[PDB]
C-alpha cells in the first residue's frame, strides 16, 4: 500500500497527477450530490404535506422544480461517480502495465541461482495474481473504502450540525462499537484466510509438479498417489474457505445489527423530537433516508469484497519480486572488450560453491589459450558446467580471478562479455514455436540466407527435406515434439548462427550417432580460420577430442594435468590414460 | 451454465439438494422482509403525521411497536440474506473441490500427444482461472442476479396491485427500455472484452515462454527483444481494458439515467395522485423508498461485477478441459497378464505417424525375444523412442499389431501393461523435491533398505557421501540443480527400484564417463538372473552393446537387419559395419 501509492502518485509526470486530482474532485462532487438529494426529498415531502382542497387542480411548478431537482441530483451523483471510475480506471490500467513491465525486466535481471531455486509456474501465478490484486485494490479503493468513508464523514457532520448533539452521541457511539467489533472479529478471522492461502498454494504446486512430469508419472503408474496428494490439500482448502465464508457472514450480521440498532434509535429519537414540536416529518424521512443510503453500501462493501487482504498480500508479494536483490552486476567504470583479439581465459586460484556448505572447485587454476581447440574431460560430477557458468559470469567465485587478456571479468560490461561467448548447454530447452524462430533466435537481425546456410551447415537439411512443413513445424512444449538429436543439432545451429568468438560446446554430441557427429565435427572444424575462435569442448566421448590441441583433466576441482593427447597417453599412470584404455577396451 | 447446474443440483446426493432448497427459502424470506420494511416506514410516517398538542407527553407504544418492527424487519432481511450466502458458500466450495478433482484425473487420463501439443503453465492458469470463475459465478448468482430479479418481480407486483395500472405502465415501459438499452450496448461492448482476453493470454504465454528458457535467453542476450515482445501485448491489453471500462461507465450511466427518469416520473405521478386526495404522503415515501432500494443494488450490480462474461468464459473452458476425448483406453473385456512369463514383444506390419502427414515407421516388423538383452541402433531421427512409446501404448498405430505372447496389447488392461514395463527416457525431468523422494518415486510402498541398496547399486553412493545433506538436497526446478550424470543415474535408480520385467533403457548413458558407464553396466548385468528380464537397450555408443544378444538396425522405419555382433561385423557392407568402423576410426 506504499509502492502502489508511489505508482499512482509518482515523482514527476504531472499529467497522471492531474488525472488523479480530477478523479478526486469528481468523487467529492458525487458525494456532495448524494448527500444533497434527501434534502430535496425532505422539501418535496414537507411541501406536499399541506391540506389540498381541490382534486382537479394541477400540481404547482414550485413542487415540480423540487421533483426535477431530486431527479437531477440523483442522476448527477451517479454520473459523477461513474466519470470518476472511468478516469481512475485509465490511471489504474497504466499503473498495471508499468508495474508488469518493470517487474518482468527485473525478473530477467536476476542471477541463475535464484531462478533455479524457484518454480516458473509459481512465478507466473504470482505475477498474474499480483496484477489482479493491484486491479482489485485500486477498484475497491476508488469505489468502496474512500467514498463511503467520505460519506460517513459528511453524514456525521450533517447530523451534528442539523439536529443537536444527541444524534452526535448516537453516531459516535455506533462508530465506536462498529470499530471495536470489526477489529476484534477481523483479528479472529485472519487465521482461516492464512490457512486457505497456504492450502491453495500447496494445491497449485502439486498440480504443476504433476503436470510438468507427465511422462514420469505415466511411466511409474503414480496417477492415484498424486491424485490423493492433490486431494488432501484440496480438502484443507475447502475446509478453510468454508470457515472463512461463515465467519464473514457472522461479521456482516453483527456489523449490520449494530448499524440497524443505530438507525432505529435515531428514528426513535427523531420521533420523540417530533412529539415536542421542534421537528417535523421531513426530519424523520431525512434522517432515515440518510442513514439508509449509508447502510446499504456498507452491506455491499462488507459482502462483495470478501478478498481484499488477500489482494494486499498478492500485491505485496509482487512488489517483493520487484524489490529483490540482484547480485551479479558490472562495476562502477566498466571496461569494454577489444576489437580483434582472440580471448584466452585464465583461472587463477578460483574457488566456488553453489551453496556455502560444499566447495566444487577446490583451488583450481588453469588457462584456456587463444586460438586453440581445447577439451575438458573428467568424471561425471567434477564441475565442468561449473567452469562454464563461471566464464559466462552467471555466478561469481569466492576467491581467485577469471581473467581475460590480463583484465578481470568483474570490470567488463556483462552484456559485452556475454555477446562474445557462444555456448551450447547439456540440457537444451526450446521455445514453443517453429524451427525457423528457434534457429533465428541466435541473431535476430540475421538475413535468411545465413539461416538457410547455417541449417544446412548444422546437418539438419534432410530433416527439413523430410518434414511436410519444413521451417514451420511447431516443436511443442520445451522441444519435446522432436528427439534429442534434432534438439542438439538445433542448439549447435543457434551457436553457429550467433557466430561468437569463444564457443563453449558443453556436450555438443550426446544423442547423435557416429556418422552425424563425425560429419558435424568436420563441418565445424572446416568453418573458421586458424587461431580465430577459442573453441572449448567439454566432452566425454574421447574419440571426438582426440585431435584437440590441449586437454584438461578435472576431478572435483583441482585440475590434475593438461597437455596434448599423445603426451597424455605416454604418461606413467594418468587418469586420461585409464579413461582412454577403458574407451578402447 | 449447464454443467455448473449439474454440479450444484446433481443426480442423487439429496443432502446438497436440501441445502440448495434451504438457501432458496432463506433468499425468498429475505426478499419478503426487504419488501415488508418500507410498509412499516409508511405506517410510522402516516401515524406520526397527526397534530400533536403536547410537548411533554411520551410517544405512544403503538408507534414504538412499529418502529421496532422497522428495525426487526431490516435486521431480519440482512440476517436471512447472510445465512443464505453462508449455506450456498458451503455448497459452492464443495462443488469447486469436486470439479477440481474431477478435472485433474481426466487431465491425467489423456494421451501424450495432447499434453505435448499444449503448455503446462497454460493448463495451470486455465484451471486456476476456471476455479475462480466458478466461485465468482456462484457468488454473483446467489447474491446479485437472482435476488435482484426476484426483488424486481415482487416490487413490480406491489406497484401493480397497490396503485392502479398507470404505475404498471411506467414500470413495464422502463423495464422494456432498460432491456433494449442493455442488450444493444452489451452487443457493442463484448468486442473489447474479447480483445482484452486475447491480449492477456498472449502476454501470459510470452512471459512463461521467456521464464522457462531463462538460460537460453541469457546465453544469447535476448532480454530486450523479449521485453519488447512482452510490451507490445501489454500495450494492447491496456488499450482494450481502458475501452472496456469506459464503455461500462457509459453502460451504467445510461441504465441509471433510465431508472432515475422512471423513479422521478413515479414520484411525480404519486404527487399528482396526492393532489386528487386518493393517496397520502405515506404513498409518496413508500414509492420512493421501494424504487430507491431497488435502484441502489442495480447500480452496485452493474459496477462491481464488471467481469462476469469472462468468468463464464473461464468456466466453460475449464469444462472444455473436462469434456475432452481420451483416445487411448482398454477394451470392453480387458485381459490380464500371466504370472511368471518373460514377455517377448512382436511388431508385425506396424505403421505409425504422430501426424497424418508423415509416417515414421514405414512398415516395420521385428521381434524382441524373451530373456535376451537386445539392442537397437540407428541414425539420429530413425524412430527408436517411437517404438518405445508404441510398446508403452502412449499412442497407437494405424496398422499392424504390437503382440505380447501372441495376444495384442489393445486387449490388455493399460495399468497391468504399464506396471510390467520399466523405462528410462532420453530427457529426464525430476520433481522439485529431495533425492530421497525422487528415488522413492519408483515404488511408493518400498522399504528404505531397498532404497539404500538401489542408490548404492546405481553408482550414486559417493555423491551422497560428498553432499552435506545427502538424501535431503532439493534438486530445484526440473532437476536443474544437479548435472546430467546424476540425473541419468537417478532415473536408472528409479527403474532399478521399480524392478519391472521389460526395462527399456532409452539412452541410459549419454552424459556419463567411461568408467561410470562400465561399472553401471556391470552392476546392472550382475543384478538379474538369466532369461528373466527382457532388457532392451536403445543405444548409440556401440561399445556398450557389443556383448548384446540381438542387435536391430533402424533407418526411418523398415528394420534393415537383426542379429549378433560378430555376424553383423562379418557382413558385406552393412550399416552396422560402417558405424562400427567409424566408431573404431
Ligand atoms: C477522508 C475525509 C475527508 C474529509 C472529511 C470531511 C469532513 C467534513 C465533514 C462534514 C462537513 C459537513 C458540515 C455540515 C454542515 C452543512 C450545512 C448543511 O446542512 O447544508 C446542507 C447541505 O449539506 C451538504 O451539502 C453537505 C456539505 C458538504 C460539504 C463538506 C464536504 C467536504 C468538502 C471538502 C443543506 O441544508 P441546509 O441546512 O438547509 O443549508 C444551510 C445553509 N447551506
Ligand atoms: C424469479 C421469479 C420468481 C417468481 C417471481 C415472483 C412473482 C410474484 C411477484 C409479485 C407478487 C406480489 C403480489 C403483490 C400483492 C401483495 C399484497 C400486499 O400489498 O401486501 C403487502 C406486503 O406485500 C409483500 O409482502 C410482498 C408479497 C410477497 C409474496 C410474493 C413473493 C413470492 C412468493 C413465492 C402488505 O401491504 P397491504 O396491502 O396492506 O396488505 C394487504 C393484505 N396482505
Ligand atoms: N545450483 C546447484 N546447486 C547445487 N549443486 C549444483 C548446482 N549445480 C550443479 N551442482 C552440483 O555441483 C556438482 C558438479 O556440478 P556440475 O558442474 O554440474 O558437474 P558436471 O560437469 O556438469 N557433471 P557431468 O554432466 O556428468 O559432466 C554436482 O554435485 C552438481 O550436482
Ligand atoms: N510428437 C511428435 N510429433 C511430431 N514428430 C515427432 C514427435 N515425436 C517425435 N517426433 C519426430 O519423429 C521423428 C523421429 O522420432 P523419434 O522416435 O523421437 O526418433 P529418435 O530415435 O528419438 N532420434 P534420436 O534421439 O537421435 O535417437 C523425428 O522427426 C521426430 O522429430
Ligand atoms: Mg557436466
Ligand atoms: Mg532417440
What single string gives the DSSP state of each residue in A238-285?
A: HHHHHHHHHHHHHHHHHHHHHHHHHHHHHHHHHHHHHHTTSS-HHHHH
**Shared-domain flag, residues A460 and A516:** yes
Backbone dihedral region of B60: left (phi > 0), alpha (psi from -120 to 50 degrees) or beta? beta
Distance from CA of A208 to the nearest CA of B (A): 7
Among residues A549, A517, A552, A574, which one has the least CA distance to residue A383? A552
Edge-to-edge strand list for the sheet holding B399-404: B364-368, B345-351, B399-404
φ, ψ (nearest 5 deg) of residue A551: -105, 140
How large is the C-alpha radius of gyration of chain B?
37
Distance CA B319, CA A486 (A): 37
DSSP state of B357: S
Distance CA B141, CA B308 (A): 10
**Shared-domain flag, residues A164 and A26:** yes
Edge-to-edge strand list for the sheet holding B562-563: B423-424, B504-506, B536-538, B374-378, B550-554, B562-563
Are A539 and A507 in contact by the 8 Å Cβ rule? The answer is: yes
CA A87 from chain center: how many Å? Answer: 26
**Shared-domain flag, residues A319 and A362:** no
CA of B401 to the centre of ligand 4 (A): 21
Q: Does residue A338 belong to any structural domain of this protein?
A: no
CA of B76 to the centre of ligand 2 (A): 17
Please tell me the total count of domains within chain A.
2
Look at residue A377 and give its three-state secondary structure: strand
Are A119 and B477 in contact by the 8 Å Cβ rule? The answer is: yes
Interface test with A, best of B109, B260, B384, B464 (most A CBs within 10 A): B260
Q: A312 lies in which domain range?
A: 2-323
The residue among B263, B291, B323 that closes a domain is B323
Distance from CA of A186 to the nearest CA of B (A): 17
Is B144 assigned a ligand-binding role in the annotation?
Answer: no
Task: Please give all residues whose CB falls under 5 A of ion ligand 6, grouped by chain where several chains appear.
Answer: A 483; B 384-385
Q: What angle do CA A161, A164, A168 make, to 5 degrees?
A: 80
Which residues make Cβ contacts (< 8 Å) with residue A299, sequence separation at least 6? A252, A256, B78
Are B560 and B362 in contact by the 8 Å Cβ rule? The answer is: no
**Shared-domain flag, residues B310 and B383:** no
Decide if A55 and B112 are in contact by the 8 Å CB cutoff.
Answer: no
Residue B516 is placed in which grid cell? 561410470
Which of A68, A94, A261 is closest, CB to CB, to B238?
A94
Are A217 and B430 in contact by the 8 Å Cβ rule? The answer is: no
Interface test with B, best of A193, A376, A510, A538 (most B CBs within 10 A): A510
Max Cα distance, chain A (Å): 130
Residue B311 is part of a domain; what is its CATH number? 1.20.1560.10
Ligand 4 atom at shortest distance from the alpha carbon of B384: 21
Interface test with B, best of A127, A224, A376, A513 (most B CBs within 10 A): A513
Decide if A429 and B394 are in contact by the 8 Å CB cutoff.
Answer: no
**Shared-domain flag, residues B420 and B508:** yes
**Shared-domain flag, residues A405 and A365:** yes
Q: Does residue A332 belong to any structural domain of this protein?
A: no
Q: Does residue B95 belong to any structural domain of this protein?
A: yes
Residue with cell 416490487: B155
Q: Nearest C-alpha to atom 13 of ligand 3 is from which residue?
A: A381
Return contacts of B169-174, CB within 8 angstroms, 24+ apart.
B170/B262, B170/B265, B170/B266, B170/B269, B171/B262, B171/B266, B173/B262, B174/B258, B174/B259, B174/B261, B174/B262
Distance CA B548, CA B373 (A): 6
Q: What angle do CA B406, B556, A456 make, to 5 degrees?
A: 160
The residue among B323, B354, B372 that closes a domain is B323
Residue A556 is part of a domain; what is its CATH number? 3.40.50.300
**Stretch 142-171 of chain B: residues touching chain A, C-beta under 8 Å:** 143
**Shared-domain flag, residues B228 and B285:** yes
**Residue A371: HSE in the Cβ half-sphere, 13 Å Cα cutoff:** 7
Q: Does residue A331 belong to any structural domain of this protein?
A: no
Among residues A259, A31, A225, which one has the least CA distance to residue B108? A225
Strands B504-506, A562-563: parallel, antiparallel or unpaired by DSSP? unpaired
Distance CA B72, CA A260 (A): 8
Q: Does residue B328 belong to any structural domain of this protein?
A: no
Which residues of chain A have a CB within 8 Å of the CB of B257?
A: 75, 78-79
Strands A374-378, A536-538: parallel, antiparallel or unpaired by DSSP? parallel
The residue among B323, B358, B375 that closes a domain is B323
Is B255 assigned a ligand-binding role in the annotation?
Answer: yes
Q: Does residue B427 belong to any structural domain of this protein?
A: yes
| Alpha carbon separation from A515 to A210, A520, B107, B541 (Å, rounded) | 38, 8, 41, 12
CA of A387 to the centre of ligand 5 (A): 10
**Shared-domain flag, residues A227 and A368:** no
Give this entry's resolution in angstroms: 3.4
Return contacts of A418-421, CB within 8 angstroms, 24+ apart.
A418/A392, A418/A393, A418/B218, A418/B219, A418/B221, A419/A500, A419/B221, A420/A337, A420/A343, A420/A500, A420/A501, A420/A502, A421/A391, A421/A392, A421/A500, A421/A501, A421/A502, A421/A504
**Shared-domain flag, residues B176 and B299:** yes
Substitution candidate for ligand 1 out of A26, A28, A153, A175 with most atoms within 8 A of CB: A153
Instruction: Judge residue A465's burial from the number of C-beta atoms within 10 Å of its C-beta, 0-12 exposed, 13-18 middle, 19 or more buried.
Output: exposed
**Stretch 85-144 of chain B: residues touching chain A, C-beta under 8 Å:** 85-86, 89-90, 93-94, 96-97, 100-101, 104-105, 107-109, 112, 115-121, 123-125, 127-128, 139, 143
**Shared-domain flag, residues B253 and B349:** no
**Stretch 371-410 of chain A: residues touching chain B, C-beta under 8 Å:** 378-381, 385, 392, 394
Distance from CA of A191 to the nearest CA of B (A): 18
**Shared-domain flag, residues B57 and B194:** yes
Which of B123, B426, B466 is closest, CB to CB, to A211?
B123
* B139, closest residue in chain A (CA to CA): A304
CA B346 from chain center: how many Å? Answer: 38
What experimental approach yielded this model?
cryo-EM
| Alpha helices per DSSP H over A330-442 | 385-391, 414-418, 435-439
Among residues A61, A83, A309, which one has the least CA distance to residue A197? A309
Q: Does residue A333 belong to any structural domain of this protein?
A: no
**Residue B96: HSE in the Cβ half-sphere, 13 Å Cα cutoff:** 29
Ligand 1 atom at shortest distance from the alpha carbon of A157: 10
Q: Each residue of A170-198: b (16+ CB within 10 Å) or e?
A: bbeebeebbeeebeeeeeebeebbebbbe
Instruction: Judge residue A424's burial from the number of C-beta atoms within 10 Å of its C-beta, 0-12 exposed, 13-18 middle, 19 or more buried.
Output: buried
Decide if A274 and B52 are in contact by the 8 Å CB cutoff.
Answer: yes
| Alpha carbon separation from A81 to A19, A33, B144, B236, B300 (Å, rounded) | 15, 10, 20, 27, 12
Residue A495 is placed in which grid cell? 551457436
Q: Does residue A335 belong to any structural domain of this protein?
A: no
Sign of CA dihedral A138, A142, A147, A148: negative
CA of A360 to the centre of ligand 3 (A): 8
Let me know how many helices (H) and strands (E) chain A has, helices first.
20, 9
Is B247 assigned a ligand-binding role in the annotation?
Answer: no
Angle between helices B120-140 and A120-140 (to 10 degrees): 30
**Shared-domain flag, residues B250 and B299:** yes
**Strand locations in B201-289 (E):** none
* A272, closest residue in chain B (CA to CA): B59
Is B173 assigned a ligand-binding role in the annotation?
Answer: no
Residue B358 forms contact with A (CB below 8 Å): yes
DSSP state of B442: S
Verify whether ligand 2 is closer than 6 Å to residue B528 (CB atom).
Answer: no
Amino acid at each position: 500500500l506504499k509502492d502502489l501509492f508511489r505508482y499512482i502518485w509518482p515523482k514527476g509526470n504531472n499529467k497522471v497527477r492531474i488525472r488523479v486530482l480530477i478523479a478526486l474532485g469528481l468523487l467529492i462532487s458525487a458525494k456532495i450530490l448524494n448527500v444533497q438529494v434527501p434534502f430535496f426529498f425532505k422539501q418535496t415531502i414537507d411541501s406536499m404535506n399541506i391540506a389540498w382542497d381541490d382534486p382537479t387542480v394541477a400540481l404547482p411548478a414550485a413542487i415540480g422544480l423540487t421533483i426535477l431537482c431530486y431527479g437531477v441530483a440523483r442522476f448527477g451523483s451517479v454520473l459523477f461517480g461513474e466519470l470518476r471510475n472511468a478516469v481512475f480506471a485509465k490511471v489504474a490500467q497504466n499503473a498495471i502495465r508499468t508495474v508488469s513491465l518493470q517487474t518482468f525486466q527485473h525478473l530477467m535481471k536476476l542471477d541463475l541461482g535464484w531462478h533455479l531455486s524457484r518454480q516458473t509456474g509459481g512465478l507466473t501465478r504470482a505475477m498474474d495474481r499480483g496484477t489482479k490484486g493491484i486491479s482489485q485494490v485500486l477498484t475497491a479503493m476508488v469505489f468502496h473504502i474512500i467514498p463511503i468513508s467520505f460519506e460517513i464523514s459528511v453524514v456525521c457532520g450533517i447530523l451534528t450540525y442539523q439536529f443537536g448533539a444527541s444524534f452526535a452521541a448516537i453516531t459516535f457511539s455506533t462508530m465506536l462499537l462498529y470499530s471495536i467489533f470489526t477489529i476484534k472479529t477481523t483479528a479472529w478471522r485472519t487465521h482461516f484466510r492464512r490457512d486457505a492461502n497456504k492450502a491453495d498454494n500447496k494445491a497449485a504446486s502439486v498440480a504443476l509438479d504433476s503436470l510438468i512430469n507427465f511422462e514420469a508419472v505415466k511411466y511409474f503408474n503414480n496417477e492415484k498417489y498424486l491424485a490423493d496428494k492433490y486431494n488432501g490439500s484440496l480438502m484443507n482448502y475447502r475446509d478453510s474457505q468454508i470457515k472463512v465464508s461463515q465467519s464473514l457472514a457472522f461479521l456482516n450480521s453483527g456489523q449490520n445489527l449494530i448499524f440497524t440498532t443505530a438507525l432505529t434509535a435515531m428514528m426513535y429519537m427523531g420521533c420523540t423530537g417530533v412529539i415536542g414540536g421542534n421537528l417535523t416529518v421531513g426530519d424523520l424521512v431525512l434522517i432515515n433516508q440518510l442513514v439508509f443510503q449509508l447502510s446499504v453500501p456498507l452491506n455491499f462493501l462488507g459482502s462483495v469484497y470478501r478478498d481484499l487482504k488477500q489482494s494486499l498480500i498478492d500485491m505485496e508479494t509482487l512488489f517483493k519480486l520487484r524489490k529483490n536483490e540482484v547480485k551479479i552486476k558490472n562495476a562502477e567504470r566498466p571496461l569494454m572488450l577489444p576489437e580483434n583479439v582472440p580471448y584466452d581465459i585464465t583461472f587463477e586460484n578460483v574457488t566456488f560453491g553453489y551453496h556455502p556448505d560444499r566447495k566444487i572447485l577446490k583451488n583450481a587454476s588453469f588457462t584456456i589459450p587463444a586460438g586453440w581447440k581445447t577439451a575438458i574431460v573428467g568424471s561425471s560430477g567434477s564441475g565442468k558446467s561449473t567452469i562454464l557458468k563461471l566464464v559466462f559470469r552467471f555466478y561469481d567465485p569466492e576467491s581467485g580471478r577469471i581473467l581475460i587478456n590480463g583484465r578481470d571479468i568483474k570490470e567488463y560490461d556483462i552484456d559485452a562479455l556475454r555477446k562474445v561467448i557462444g555456448v551450447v548447454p547439456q540440457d537444451t530447452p526450446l521455445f514453443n514455436d517453429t524451427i525457423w524462430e528457434n534457429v533465428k533466435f541466435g541473431r535476430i537481425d540475421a538475413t535468411d540466407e545465413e539461416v538457410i546456410t547455417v541449417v544446412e551447415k548444422a546437418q539438419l537439411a534432410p530433416l527439413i527435406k523430410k518434414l511436410p512443413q519444413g521451417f514451420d513445424t511447431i516443436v511443442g512444449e520445451r522441444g519435446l515434439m522432436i528427439s534429442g538429436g534434432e534438439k542438439q543439432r538445433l542448439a549447435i545451429a543457434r551457436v553457429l548462427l550467433k557466430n561468437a568468438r569463444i564457443m563453449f560446446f558443453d556436450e555438443a554430441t550426446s544423442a547423435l550417432d557416429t556418422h552425424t557427429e563425425q560429419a558435424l565435427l568436420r563441418t565445424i572444424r572446416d568453418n573458421f580460420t586458424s587461431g580465430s575462435r577459442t573453441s572449448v569442448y567439454i566432452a566425454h566421448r574421447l574419440r571426438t577430442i582426440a585431435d584437440a590441441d590441449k586437454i584438461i583433466v578435472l576431478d572435483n576441482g583441482r585440475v590434475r594435468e593438461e597437455g596434448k593427447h599423445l603426451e597424455l597417453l605416454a604418461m606413467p599412470g594418468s587418469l586420461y590414460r585409464e579413461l582412454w584404455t577403458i574407451q578402447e577396451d
